């Protein structure tokens, strides 16, 4: 126990010199921020790095990137010693050479291509024998410091000499700094955290676990859409833990002749038990162990049973962890999802917008992006793209850039100039074309995300906001108060009202306010599941809400599935609707126990909504969303026109005036049509300008800046002229009538 | 390390304990159990430990010397199963321990036992416990292990297992995962599978000429097993190791937390109440997760290079309620969709009013169950079919649960949606399972809530002409209730909020013929309902519950409960706003005097009730009330002409 012994962990910044320490620990050790320190790890390796303050880290831990850890021969979970060394001296000369494996191909003036940008700006520490990674030219180059002056530890300065005229140096048992790690996986922070907490603790410290006597889980099953990771996560975990990684591949096992498959499985498990700590990644485990209802062979059953027997025998193990991978858990035999066998299941799903941005940054870090390349725009425009698609579009952009620049460089040269590679800047046009030429792969997969819609996006409905805060936010963020008061709240809400009122924007808004997950489900999506025959899919959705708690499971378009049996149901023989309704009722009955799952509904046909959904426990909190009044219409106009140029002569108050019985959708269509008219006018004006130029191309160029297009009052007048109502007053009065009669359907009624 | 103060000193400090040389005693702590053997005692082999007595534990570890593992699974390591374990003991212990007496008597006891239940509920644990407690030669045949070995070797392994069991008599042959070995013929599509099934059947038949051999199979459900195995000589006894009730979950948690030192405020009762649908495996996994969280928290204290952890550190690792709460949040149930047989906690006090209904239910259900001899003596048998009808929210379910609790009989809750969603009625066998369960759990109260969705009148009341699921399920229910009349101690209760569309077939004698009307609560009933709902909640004294009960005509109990919920929501909002204002005041002047006048005693003020009533509304129209009153004399008149 010493104040300078700290447990290494993953870092935030990717630089090879910055090391972040908790300010409390630095103050305890009396360390000046932004100064040089020395870190010692395992064997006898040590490094010199500049420290910095980071309150996010914990006192007993220090954060470093894979480069420094590799230099120290320390994995995650190890302990390192830190010593103040402010006496470090600037070096007069440094002899640095690259590595043969990493620099294969590219040749030329590597110095100015890689090292000069890497050292020109910041004064960086350097230690003899250390390897640092430089990214550029669509590749990463590892440079080993052959020699330093005046001592093994030095600080590079602008006046310092750099010598890189030597030949490539061998790797000499060094690990590939480009190996997959936690920094090469993006869009998965919660799942990766769970995997780390399960795996790193036993594998790095097996002696402590076997001395304690507690048995940690060994069965891990990563399920998710193809291209979402899984294989990448297992390799990253194996490389970060250093555990003996055995990659069992489903098809590889299933190709080898009968009897050899069982032999291969047995050998894999036995060898894993010999190289403990170890990992056994079973990729494509669905082929090995499909459902019995699907397999139609004997050898398949024999292999399934052998796998089950081996997993059972792994109870008497040697720190062995099995890490399977499949597209979905349903295709796997149920026997594998039991105790001792694969009992932990991690969903590597489709990343949200920030996850896609992280993936793009990961796959574009080796490339020099040109200006105006807004990765945020691409991430926002890449809905339904799994990490593989985002890696493929970046590759397509890089290939387009290479094709464009090929005409510059003759195609017979074996090695391309390093300066040329570093000067190949990928333009936003390349990414736009690649995105246009690419299509999503997980578009039909259920998406769990926090919606961007906020309260400001919706105008009016203040009382509805109050009720939703009292009904949803308080149970979630303040459950202790509800438990104390002596009774539990209801987790079922039902929005009803005219179409276009903003039910979906309210569900998303409350989800964003509570910072809870949001799952959007529509009746058409439920029914189209083989016309309701694939019932299990429904049970999946609720299960997902159970994993993503807190959650807001929204059921839009309930008027198509929750149709009253007989009276409201359009199809007597259409058993899909009744089947799905009964499944929903059963699952909502089973969901009451889960405290942090809230189920919301939405129907524009409250008369035909089945009264079973109105039972307590189920969707019993009826909420009526009326047509916006004058002030509500003004607010909706402001919201719709937000982030758009509008002329000052437009009196939005006048537009809100009159216009009775207009839903928000109609108001948005008004703005869209007005914008279409404005676009037509701008196009016509540009055409007239082009014609005038063609008549007299020598005319004075009146460059008075690009015209600031704004929605003029004439455009709004035309849009209103062609605009129309979407809710008749008869519907309004019927909704008002059902504002006191919808609840009265569970008893006598429904006719 | 210092094992003495870690284990022995707490074990001997309080009580004066006897000790005998050569005996081993078990001490639990530090997530492990330690067996200590008494090497020497004074003044004789038998002694009593006292505070002044010297204890010497500086010697090296001692060998086991053929002693049995005191941590081996036993009847004390299995919880949530007392009736089933009692049956297993009565079947197994008597012959195995006393085979000579049984072979001298000449009576043949059963040999085929089949433990069926959801995964994680035991089965494997029960068999090991029985084997260890009886000392019988235990042979563990594993389904996948047999099915992996090449063709011809599987039959050889089965034959060797049975032959060796017949040599080490008394013996036991636990066939785990027997569904893989012997699945239904309709599912198996191979020859080797049929050969193994037939070999198993032949061996079980040959076990008629046995040597005190008992076969103890295990499967998830009996349906997946070939029917041939459920016959005489073969697996004829079937034991359901189901999901434990609340007390069973508490026992499981105590079993899995006895080696760990629980900190104060760790209320295992709260966890058991919050762990509905959790099989024993889930409850063992959540405890493990809590222990691992505690270990992770305490790891920073102890360097991670040490091979052995200090015993004092292990004994000082106290698991906090926060760890269990996080583990429960991160865990999910496994048997949530499984039918649950339990005695409900609802009592008569939970329901207000309906005194005449209570009288009728006591005369109709309790007396036949607790006093069947009187009914038999009087000369005729009662009816086992009841049907609650009335406005929604009146308290039918709370009455069924209440009568079940009063009779201390099992209660099975079944809803129409649960029946229909069984592959849209195609998996008909599931229905026949439910009644069978009521036959095992006698006395029982099999409740059918939401009968308005399945018992819809054929054509007139049925919403789907092509929806054969409803008619199929209704016919299955009718057949099973016809077959259930013989079982004296099974009572079937129904509940429908649409009595007009209820099929008249269910009104036939033998079936649900005792019609019971549950009306909307009157003023006194509303007062009682308000008292029941506000029970176990803080309420201000200024609130005149009598005034709330006054007026408020045509309000069901559900509406009254929603009133209280909304009032509580308003109170919570007010408390949150007051706390926010307090925080703002502190931020403006953090040096202000701390007025620590105890935490505010939040109570539902009359203003909150006024607001809730303002936003409250009725759920039953007077038209519905009068229609229900009309059907109070017309519902029975549907079996003959009617239904239109
Ligand atoms: N979350 C991610 N973050 C970063 N790169 C990713 C991510 N997901 C996929 N990739 C990249 O895309 C490649 C292909 O996806 P990969 O995860 O290897 O396929 P998989 O999920 O194993 N496919 P399957 O086993 O058929 O479902 C990876 O090797 C990475 O290069
Ligand atoms: N209160 C509002 N403020 C601003 N825009 C609104 C509002 N209500 C509706 N809108 C606009 O109208 C669109 C449709 O509203 P939405 O929330 O989808 O209504 P819905 O009733 O769920 N739709 P539907 O089922 O098709 O009748 C929104 O996406 C906005 O563009
Ligand atoms: N009723 C119980 N009481 C105490 N511990 C239990 C109970 N049920 C399960 N456990 C614990 O959970 C572990 C796993 O359950 P176990 O009963 O061994 O699985 P199983 O029922 O044989 N599974 P399967 O054969 O696939 O249906 C046991 O070994 C015990 O540690
Ligand atoms: N007599 C009562 N005393 C107290 N609370 C009651 C009473 N009746 C109903 N409640 C409350 O109302 C809830 C619903 O009653 P329940 O017994 O489920 O009626 P139901 O008619 O079976 N329901 P549904 O089929 O949804 O119309 C109960 O769980 C209580 O919270
Ligand atoms: Mg893969
Ligand atoms: Mg909608
Ligand atoms: Mg088992
Ligand atoms: Mg009911």
UniProtKB/Swiss-Prot annotation, chain A:
The modification Phosphoserine is found at residue 17. Gene3D superfamilies: 1.10.8.60, 2.40.40.20, 3.10.330.10, 6.10.20.150, P-loop containing nucleotide triphosphate hydrolases (3.40.50.300). ADP binds at residues 186, 224-232, 363. It comes from the Eukaryota. Coiled coil: none annotated. GO terms for biological process: cell division; negative regulation of defense response; pollen germination; pollen tube growth; protein destabilization; protein transport. Transmembrane segments: none annotated. ATP binds at residues 497-505. Keywords: Acetylation, ATP-binding, Cell cycle, Cell division, Cell membrane, Cytoplasm, Cytoskeleton, Membrane, Nucleotide-binding, Nucleus, Phosphoprotein, Protein transport, Repeat, Transport. SMART domains: AAA, CDC48_2, CDC48_N. One of its GO terms (cellular component) is plasma membrane. Its main location: nucleus. One of its GO terms (molecular function) is ATP binding. It holds the Pfam family AAA. Probably functions in cell division and growth processes. Interacts with certain SNAREs as part of specialized membrane fusion events where vesicles from the same organelle fuse (homotypic fusion). PANTHER family: AAA-FAMILY ATPASE (PTHR23077), CELL DIVISION CONTROL PROTEIN 48 HOMOLOG A (PTHR23077:SF138). Belongs to the AAA ATPase family. Homohexamer. Interacts with SERK1, GRF6, KAPP and SYP31, but not with KNOLLE. Component of the SERK1 signaling complex, composed of KAPP, CDC48A, GRF6 or GRF7, SERK1, SERK2, SERK3/BAK1 and BRI1. Interacts with PUX1, PUX2, PUX3, PUX4, PUX5, PUX7 and PUX11 via its N-terminus. This is Cell division control protein 48 homolog A. It comes from Arabidopsis thaliana (Mouse-ear cress). The lineage of its organism: Eukaryota, Viridiplantae, Streptophyta, Embryophyta, Tracheophyta.
